[PDB]
Amino acid sequence: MPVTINNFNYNDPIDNNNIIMMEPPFARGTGRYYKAFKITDRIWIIPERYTFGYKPEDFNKSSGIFNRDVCEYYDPDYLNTNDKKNIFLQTMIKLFNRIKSKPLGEKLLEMIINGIPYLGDRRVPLEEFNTNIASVTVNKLISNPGEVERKKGIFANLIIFGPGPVLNENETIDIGIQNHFASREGFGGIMQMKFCPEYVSVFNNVQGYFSDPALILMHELIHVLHGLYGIKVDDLPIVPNEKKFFMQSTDAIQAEELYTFGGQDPSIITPSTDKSIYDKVLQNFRGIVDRLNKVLVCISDPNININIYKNKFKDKYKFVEDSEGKYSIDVESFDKLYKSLMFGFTETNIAENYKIKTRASYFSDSLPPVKIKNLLDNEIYTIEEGFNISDKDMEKEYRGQNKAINKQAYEEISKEHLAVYKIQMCVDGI
């Protein structure tokens, strides 16, 4: 149905419906419960710092870096108080309203909501549904504070956290169990995001400009979409040559990251690799279709109706049913769906449709990030037009995003809190 974004404050009481105490997948059941807010069906916002896999001290600017590709900005006091956590929620609500304000973004969202993870894993027998895995189920606490622990399970598609140590490094992480990823095997799994709306990336087309946070969020939501469909597969990556001094160092770049950006970048992935991915994705779907024809019981939950979820997955992966009830893959349906998911929803295609300026390539030079003064101020940023507000004379030629023209929309960032990976080039003499 039509996507409805919810309204709420951080101060609002827990009602165990739209506002809950959630035990996220990486908490490992260690009793670390977070206050969670359902923004749309199957999408949750936790307005707190992402601390999973990081050390408390890592949130401080040190003589080191996490990733060599990012101008890394640290700020430990971001989202440290209730008033600040509330700003986060309302900003996320405003960005979500910007997304659904055009049909394309609305489709992206409804894809995400309805693209529920398969109730299983590679370890689950074909004849079975199993909810009792961390990539499918997440616990909510329904007990009064300081009482006998009583928990209940909910299905979730996406959980959005605030940023980790580096504010401008927005990532979408998937869930691995015993060195295997359901969101890479056709099953799909609960997706998580570390996101920050205030501190955006900067670029400059040589042939600068600050980035619209709704696009940055949509970029990440595409990753989420791939993860929920179990098509974020690993294939031969682009690896940089590091044998010479003048060569840039970076991590392996997966095709999935280049498809997601879109534009000219998919051409860096060879037709051979294109076909390898396609085949793997098809071979995963063939497994799923086989499972649905064989699934009889659900051991972990007796209240799961088998026919309901058989019909839903059929509608998720667009399987075809004959008169007897057997499911199969219609090659044309799969091809259309594959190409829509991989080459339809892209940062470039979306930017064109949303009249937002973006960087030209993934391999473009990145510049120091900027803090957006106020996203809740409709003279700066709106739901319908973002920064490029026409009644402020900012629509033409992306004037609203231009750093020279719209100087009041942004503040520059102190060099003391920026961590850039530098190469020290010495003469080798003296």
């Binding site: 996490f66 909501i113 209940k152």
Partner: protein, 410 residues
């Protein structure tokens, strides 16, 4: 003491490794009567996606409520920091060292432009300039208070004229890119137009990479006893698959071009942008110093329009960058069409010959079941493999200015 220049990792050259590109073209292919071609267009029309009913959710979303999670088995990733500094040692004087020679510390007030690169590295009050020595000496001349406005107007005017130097043999060429960066091979040394007229775009490249061009693997056609139709279809399918391999090879070359050559030329474009700025920054600090020499009486007499100067300098660079973009883009496509595609065509023509021999021999082995039509199919194979699939860059890049460069070629 160590003499170390600092450079951001992002300002280095990205060059994709040889292991980044699939070798799958080298594999054998089975050709059967019902074998069909596989193309994956890296594109999907956005206007269809909105209207496509086959992507709207047709079943209601189930309730979220379920049984509690008890199996907390999960892999939690661990993040540790790595040092933000990496020390390296080289005797080379590439883009980075040539760009550093165009900078100055904050402490230094009295600076002068020079044409000697080594003197610009050594003394922290000399700054390297890549414009004509006629410009350089004009930027170092001290004048009277009344002649100061005649100096500024002229020197900023001279900056524009020096930045738009372009002569000459396809498209336009900027002769001071070599002096500005010394990128690739001894670019500052000797004449740039001469060195280019000999080797072309290749001398600008910091690293010439080994191209991956696999030998396309043999086709293995299956036999069908006494079935003329399946034999003919197999020959057809083999011929259509041949086109698939040409297309694939072209994709492989492009993927290597973009991630290996075109990235270098992007850096060189960014390098020139920095150089032109550093030159305008050096000119600004020179004017600043000469202005401060005067007394309050001399300064008040002549009101300099600084609003016009910054406008003139920004526009001066803007015109120059357009010329540099034009030349460098043409170079990047030049290298594709002259040093990359023809090498692949060569190997694809080899594939054609191997396939021709394959097919004729296959026709030879089935001459009995083909009745008296074996010669007919022989010439069909002969005629078809005489026509090749031409390369078109528009398949790999949408709505671009690089296609205009490509359409210029024969």
């Amino acid at each position: 003491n160590l003499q170390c220049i600092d450079v951001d990792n992002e300002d280095l050259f990205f060059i994709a490794d040889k292991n980044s590109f699939s070798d799958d073209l080298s594999k054998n292919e089975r050709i059967e009567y019902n074998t069909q071609s596989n193309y994956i267009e890296n594109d999907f029309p956005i206007n269809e996606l909105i209207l496509d009913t086959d992507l709207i959710s047709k079943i209601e979303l189930p309730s979220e409520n379920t049984e509690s999670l008890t199996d907390f088995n999960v892999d939690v990733p661990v993040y540790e920091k790595q040092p933000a500094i990496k020390k390296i040692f080289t005797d080379e004087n590439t883009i980075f060292q040539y760009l550093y020679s165009q900078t100055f510390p904050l402490d230094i007030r009295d600076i002068s432009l020079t044409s000697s690169f080594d003197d610009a590295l050594l003394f922290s009050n000399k700054v390297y300039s890549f414009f004509s020595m006629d410009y350089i000496k004009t930027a170092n001349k001290v004048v009277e208070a009344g002649l100061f406005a005649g100096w500024v107007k002229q020197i900023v005017n001279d900056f524009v004229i020096e930045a738009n130097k372009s002569n000459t043999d396809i498209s336009l060429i900027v002769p001071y890119i070599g002096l500005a960066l010394n990128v690739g091979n001894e670019t500052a040394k000797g004449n740039f137009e001469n060195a280019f007229e000999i080797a072309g775009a290749s001398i600008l490249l910091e690293f010439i990479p080994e191209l991956l061009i696999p030998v396309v693997g043999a086709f293995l056609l299956e036999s069908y006893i006494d079935n003329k139709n399946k034999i003919i279809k197999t020959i057809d399918n083999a011929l259509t698959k041949r086109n698939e391999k040409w297309s694939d090879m072209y994709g492989l070359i492009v993927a290597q071009w973009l991630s290996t050559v075109n990235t270098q030329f992007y850096t060189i474009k960014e390098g020139m942008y920095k150089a032109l700025n550093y030159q305008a920054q050096a000119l600004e600090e020179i004017i600043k110093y000469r202005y401060n020499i005067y007394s309050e009486k001399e300064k008040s007499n002549i009101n300099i329009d600084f609003n016009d100067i910054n406008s003139k300098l920004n526009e001066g660079i803007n015109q120059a960058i357009d010329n540099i973009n034009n030349f460098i883009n043409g170079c990047s496509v030049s290298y594709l069409m002259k040093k990359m595609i023809p090498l692949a065509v060569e190997k694809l023509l080899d594939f054609d010959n191997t396939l021709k021999k394959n097919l004729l021999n296959y026709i030879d082995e089935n001459k009995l079941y083909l009745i008296g039509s074996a010669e007919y199919e022989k010439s069909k194979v002969n005629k078809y493999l005489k026509t090749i699939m031409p390369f078109d860059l528009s398949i790999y890049t949408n709505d671009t200015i690089l296609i205009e460069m490509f359409n210029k070629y024969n």
